[PDB]
Predict the structure of Bromodomain-containing protein 1.
Amino acid sequence: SMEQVAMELRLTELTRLLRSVLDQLQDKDPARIFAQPVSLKEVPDYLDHIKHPMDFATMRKRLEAQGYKNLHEFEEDFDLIIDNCMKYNARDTVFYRAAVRLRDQGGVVLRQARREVDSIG
């Protein structure tokens, strides 16, 4: 149908905008602490602690399959990255601190993303 096509064009355009958001958030992680999944070879107990692991490469895979239907779904995954780190790692660690800085800096990016998503529809 033509409606299905229009819906698909909307999803494509959301994916475009979320790709730019993802790039901007990942720039706020210049140490690449959140770039890849926590290695279960190197942290073998991780899944005992963290039930839903997340990282930027995993988000990018979902994004490129057009697997985010709306900004809320995308934000859920970004918040997992931050929140998982702040639980597994203590306050005095470079990992926790990186997560705080990512959260604080990403907030600005996400605030305008939400306005754009609503504005363009």
In short: DSSP finds five helices and no strands in the chain. The helical segments are 2-27, 46-49, 56-64, 71-88, 94-120. The chain has one domain: 1-121.
